[PDB]
Design a protein around this nucleic acid. Structure first.
Lengths: 292, 121, 343, 284
RNA sequence: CAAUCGCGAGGGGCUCCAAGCGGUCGCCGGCGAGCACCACCCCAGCCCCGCGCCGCCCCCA
């Protein structure tokens, strides 16, 4: 019933762009228990549930074409590389697992590296550049890697959980910038933009009260859309600040997806109120819309 | 290069050198390449670290052979000076080996540490 | 002007007042020959440095009992030296005037009281504008909260990553940024104007890293203009780096010290430069005469002072004067001793 | 509307009957200065003196000072309607429905922007910038300008095109001002809480419990003490980070290397001493 | 400590007694300690969650 993943086909004629949702039954639905899904373009979508299988999905057949799997354990994130292709998929055991998307086949290619602590469960990824990766962790750390060599760049460690109870900052969502910096949407409500050349933080914007589960940037690097375990989304503008926050949603917001083409620059959010809800990017322009 | 079990500077090197220092305080530590080689050939060794900052690394490339024969885990840290004052020597220790006994919390730390080294190799 | 291998130091008569605890902090006034002494026995003392004084030489100006705090650090503020900010382990810190006689209690750092349960580990910039506090929360890192002392308000934060947080840090001598010694061997050259890290670089082989000082002239003006940095570790080794050789802004990730200082065997606890940038006094408080003294830029340890028979005690704090001509050593039993330096 | 002195130790308060100055350091009122009603504003004179400028509800321009009682005799009535708003610069300008200086909706207030001048006019939802939510109050900072508008609700829009919502207050805001170096946005409210907007890393920290009184706050000339006007007929000079009222108003070379210059080739078969001297001076 | 107030095992017909135990306001009551109930790691345990064996009860047979 609930949303767990949204993705647009492109993000930039009659070019077939489509919208791919993942419904918490296990379903997938496309507009004009699954846990993640991406597209690939150079266009086919890949999804994971909680099990270790990462599966393609043929659309005109509407059947699970070309399953893939592996040894390690539960995939909790994956993503595709940009151009100057593979997949990177981080799991519970601290492995990050590269899958090959050589021309048509989805192969279990290679496990590059893994954290020494088994108690570091990865949560999300985003790609700072072509060949180097940003991954959140179940501890306070988010961490960079290189896939040319597999190596482990600087741990970008967040603090403790000050507000009460737990110790660990569980980083639920990580995204990137065209500027070269990376936003980390952690637990405890906060967001923080980390610098990209030196991999340290530069700003720690506290807006939400409960953990930001998802966020997404504009395609020009201008507006940042966060969405939390509260009923709350919030926008950010230029180093940065927030503008406002309206409870568009009714449960926690669980998945964002932005699009900036065809004269229709919209960002679509979904959570656990079973109601996908679409926003413009020009947030002072006009109202919003929702679809069920 | 030949340092295919290269330990990562994000705190695995730090836990290696810290356990080097604690084994140095429990006298479970054979320091230097020759005494490391004696501990591996005699089979007393529980874990062994080398240094990839060796100026010719061939002079420590010989112990991964006998560590593969005795089946003890080896791993390289990127600084013989950090290994040297990790031991507490006032010189540069190029390769260190650290043994164990029947009952110690240090032996537990060796066990978890070569569990992480087994996650590398 | 003093030559590298042999120092003309001499024993000036000591401070009369004795403390009931170890001397946690000493600080000379930046304009006048005044010594500020402060202990864990809740008491600070101001002394004027006149060696020909009578009845008791180096007489006492005033003796401030601060209630219920144990003075971990007291420091003059600014080039003029008109304020004394002091702090114990307690959740507040006072500032005190020297032109009006106002004691003010800063008890709230602005939405970061969760982040700060001490005030003890502070520094104040050489231009006197700002004042960084070690925020006492680690879980694998450490941040410095920067205070505007004209308002006493938090304006910036300086998180670095490590295991046990910040060891010890130092303001740039221009005041435009920091340099932070963490507890894994990572040292961050932070920038206040951009409020961003210039670059992170590693000490030579540091396991922990304990203390840090900084100072000199004709250094990198993009790194604050201060020339030498000394970083001390758990192994008692003090590494001394020229900060002109961190530039290759691209900081060299693995630089080489100008000199490794390996004379002391136990954990380096104090480190200081003379404010003309010609002496480095460093030491430990786990052996008796664990105080060494270094000529800069030549990086040589003086071999004639101290001797077997130099009374130092377990050195808890040192301080150079404003003219780099009087050294102060306070020990584990609560006695300051003073040495004039000639050159 | 309360105002400090150029040398910080004097506070200045207008009442509904007179003008009273105060010692910020020591005590209560210094001068009862006569000011009849047979009140719009009071600021300081800008360029040379620090006398005063008071405007009543109709045109009677009092140019009156402290350090004396001089100025109790000379009003001015050059304007015809009852005066609504009032601002001085350096050069006086008065909002009457429009300006007179030296438009659709009802006027609210009018403020002046420093030496390379600009004007900021304030109707309900309009606001007029002049180069050369329903409003309640607003402040400003130059250097090229930034305007913080409060509101009849608890939304504090910030402008530098798009505002920023800084909504906290569970009623109208009564006071919004920029702090000092522009880092914080010190705001007040009906509900006795003096909120410090962080405006950096977007946190809030405040002074909650007070005499049910917050309206018309002012900031020190330095980054120091804020003075609060207080609806229980009280002002309150609070120094900063105390949040405690200060005023309530109701060549080193080792020898062994030169030994190593002279160890091999003992006296004969040594290199010639031009070369040995080049070894020695090259060591020095 | 001083004023004050509450509940109520256990026993007896909504009431009665009582072992006890707590709260509030004043303490010109006294004592003790202040990062740190934290950082790094290891061994277990409470709880909650996964997957597979048995222990038992089944139905045909």
């Amino acid at each position: 019933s609930a949303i767990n993943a949204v993705a647009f086909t492109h993000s930039a004629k009659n070019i077939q762009v489509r919208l791919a949702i993942g419904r918490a039954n296990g379903d997938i639905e496309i507009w004009n228990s699954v846990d993640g899904l991406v597209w690939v373009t150079d266009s086919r979508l890949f999804s994971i549930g909680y099990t270790t299988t990462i599966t393609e999905w043929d659309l005109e057949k509407a059947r699970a074409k070309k399953h893939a799997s592996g040894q390690h354990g539960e995939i909790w994130c994956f993503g595709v590389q940009p151009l100057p292709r593979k997949l990177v998929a981080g799991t519970v055991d601290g492995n990050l697992v590269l899958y090959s998307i050589e021309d048509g086949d989805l192969k279990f290619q290679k496990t590059l590296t893994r954290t020494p602590s088994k108690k570091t469960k990865f949560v999300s990824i985003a790609f700072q550049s072509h060949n180097i990766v940003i991954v959140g962790c179940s501890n306070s750390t988010i961490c960079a890697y290189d896939v040319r060599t597999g190596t482990m760049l600087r741990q970008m460690t967040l603090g403790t959980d000050l507000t009460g109870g737990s110790k660990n900052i569980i980083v639920w969502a990580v995204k990137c910038l065209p500027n070269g910096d990376i936003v980390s949407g952690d637990s405890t409500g906060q967001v923080c933009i980390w610098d990209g050349k030196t991999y340290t933080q530069a700003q720690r914007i506290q807006s939400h009260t409960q953990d930001v589960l998802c966020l997404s940037v504009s395609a020009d690097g201008s507006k940042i859309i966060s969405g939390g375990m509260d009923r709350r989304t919030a926008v950010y503008e230029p180093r940065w600040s927030k503008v406002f926050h309206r409870r568009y949603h009714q449960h926690d917001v669980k998945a964002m997806a932005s699009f900036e083409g065809k004269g229709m620059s919209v960002v679509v959010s979904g959570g656990s109120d079973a109601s996908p809800i679409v926003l413009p990017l020009r947030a002072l322009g006009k109202e919003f819309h929702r679809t069920l | 290069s030949a340092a295919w079990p290269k330990a990562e500077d994000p705190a695995l090197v730090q836990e290696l050198l810290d356990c080097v220092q604690q084994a140095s305080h429990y006298r479970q530590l054979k320091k230097g390449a020759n005494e490391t080689t004696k501990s591996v050939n005699r089979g007393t060794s529980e874990l062994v670290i080398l240094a990839a900052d060796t100026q010719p690394l061939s002079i420590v490339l010989h112990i991964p052979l006998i560590c593969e024969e005795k089946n003890v885990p080896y791993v390289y840290v990127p600084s013989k000076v950090a290994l040297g004052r990790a031991c507490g020597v006032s010189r540069a220790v190029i390769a260190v080996s650290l043994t164990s006994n029947e009952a110690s919390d240090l032996n537990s730390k060796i066990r978890a540490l070569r569990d992480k080294v087994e996650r590398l190799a | 002007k003093l030559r590298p291998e042999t120092i003309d130091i001499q024993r000036t008569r000591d401070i009369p007042d004795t403390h009931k605890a170890a001397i946690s902090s000493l600080a000379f006034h930046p304009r006048y020959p005044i010594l500020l002494s402060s202990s864990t026995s809740s008491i600070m003392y101001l002394h004027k440095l006149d060696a020909s004084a009578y009845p008791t030489p180096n007489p006492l100006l005033t003796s401030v009992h601060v209630k219920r705090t144990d003075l971990r650090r007291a420091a003059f503020v600014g080039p003029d030296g008109g304020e004394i900010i002091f702090a114990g382990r307690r959740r507040y810190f006072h500032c005190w005037n020297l032109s009006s006689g106002l004691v003010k209690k800063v008890s709230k750092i602005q939405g970061h009281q969760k982040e700060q349960r001490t005030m003890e580990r502070f520094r104040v910039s050489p231009c006197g504008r700002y004042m960084a506090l070690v925020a006492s929360d680690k879980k694998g890192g450490g941040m410095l909260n920067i205070i505007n002392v004209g308002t006493m308000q938090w304006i910036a934060q300086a998180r670095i990553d490590g295991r046990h947080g910040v060891a010890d840090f130092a303001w740039w001598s221009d005041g435009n940024g920091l340099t932070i010694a963490g507890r894994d061997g990572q040292v961050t050259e932070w920038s206040m104007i951009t409020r961003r890290t210039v670059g992170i670089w590693r000490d030579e082989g540091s396991i922990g890293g304990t203390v840090m000082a900084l100072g000199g002239r004709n250094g990198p003006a993009e790194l604050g203009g201060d020339r030498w940095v000394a970083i001390g570790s758990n192994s008692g080794i003090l590494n001394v780096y020229d900060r002109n050789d961190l530039i290759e802004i691209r900081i060299k990730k693995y630089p080489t010290p100008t000199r490794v200082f390996e004379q002391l065997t136990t954990s380096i606890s104090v480190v200081a430069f003379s404010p003309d940038g010609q002496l480095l006094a460093f030491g430990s408080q786990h052996k008796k005469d664990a105080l060494r003294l270094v000529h800069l830029p030549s990086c040589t340890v003086y071999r004639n002072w101290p001797t077997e028979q130099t009374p130092l005690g377990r050195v808890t704090a040192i301080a150079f004067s404003s003219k780099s001509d009087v050294l102060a050593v306070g020990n584990d039993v609560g006695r300051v001793r003073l040495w004039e330096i000639r050159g | 509307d309360p105002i400090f002195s150029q040398d910080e130790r004097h506070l200045i308060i207008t009442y509904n009957t007179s003008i009273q100055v105060y010692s910020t350091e020591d005590s209560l009122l210094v001068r009862r200065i006569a000011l009849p009603l047979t009140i719009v504003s009071s600021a300081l004179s800008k360029s040379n003196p620090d006398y005063l400028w008071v405007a009543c509800s109709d045109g009677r321009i009092w140019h009156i000072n402290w350090t004396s009682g001089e100025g109790v005799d000379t009003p001015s009535t050059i304007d015809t309607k009852k005066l609504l708003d009032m601002a001085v610069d350096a050069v006086l300008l008065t909002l009457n429905a429009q300006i007179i200086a030296y438009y659709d909706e009802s006027p609210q207030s009018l403020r002046s922007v420093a030496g390379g001048r600009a004007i900021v006019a304030a109707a309900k939802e309009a606001l007029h910038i002049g180069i050369l939510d329903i409003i309640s109050t607003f402040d400003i900072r130059p250097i090229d300008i930034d305007v913080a508008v409060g509101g009849a609700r608890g939304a504090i829009y910030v402008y530098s095109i798009q505002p920023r919502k800084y909504h906290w207050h569970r009623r109208a805001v009564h006071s919004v001002k920029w702090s000092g170096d522009g880092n914080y946005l010190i705001s007040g409210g009906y509900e006795t809480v003096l909120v410090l907007w962080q405006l950096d890393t977007g946190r809030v920290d405040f002074l909650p419990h007070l005499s049910a009184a917050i309206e018309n706050i002012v900031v020190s000339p330095k980054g120091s003490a804020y003075a609060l006007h207080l609806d229980d007929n009280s002002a309150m000079v609070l120094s900063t980070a105390e949040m405690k009222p200060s005023m309530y108003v109701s060549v080193v070379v080792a020898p062994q290397r030169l030994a190593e210059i002279f160890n091999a080739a003992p006296a004969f078969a040594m290199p010639p001493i031009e070369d040995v001297f080049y070894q020695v001076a090259s060591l020095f």
